[PDB]
């Protein structure tokens, strides 16, 4: 089997590297990071100045064992809303990011 | 010091606590479980039959001591457009959601 991975989830796990990459989950620091990788992925959308409306999410777990289940549902126009949701990971936390481009 | 709590997040709060409550963490359940709060509380924004689009997300984490954290962004427009986050927890799960409406 092979793949190629589509531009929006290549650019947004570069952006969540750029940010978080090099780093070890130290609670004090992480909201920033986390703010910081949904603003840099955000960046990422915005700057293509497409006609849509954007959310972008982000969360960041420390890794501990724990179970986590995440999932979205919405209400849009499928003909031309959608979205994209890319795991990263590194040794002490997993970091998830999700986003919705909604049209105008 | 006192609140009373706004109807989105009181409801919201609701619908996760009807789909949920009263059960503990069950690994292979649980993807069910988070797929079936977001479509319980999509349906609490969308009988109201108002002029936007929704999206839903939730997470359900286990219970085990690690740390979380999450943050969102949008691009969209400040005077119609909005978003609610609520957390809910028992004595082995928590379940974060977070709702945004934007208007069409």
Redesign the interface.
């Known amino acids: 089997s092979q793949f190629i991975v589509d531009d929006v989830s290549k650019t947004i796990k570069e952006a969540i590297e750029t940010t978080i990459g090099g780093n070890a ?1 130290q ?1 004090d620091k ?2 920033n ?3 910081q ?3 840099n992925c ?1 960046t990422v ?2 700057k293509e100045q497409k006609p849509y ?25 499928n003909d031309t ?1 959608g ?1 994209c949701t890319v795991r990263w990971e590194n040794k002490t936390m997993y970091c998830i990011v ?1 986003v ?1 481009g ?1 049209a105008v």
């Open positions: 989950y609670h992480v909201n990071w986390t703010g990788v949904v603003e955000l959308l915005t409306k954007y959310i972008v999410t982000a969360m960041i777990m420390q890794k501990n064992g724990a179970g986590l289940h995440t999932a979205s549902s919405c209400y849009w126009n809303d979205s999700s919705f909604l």
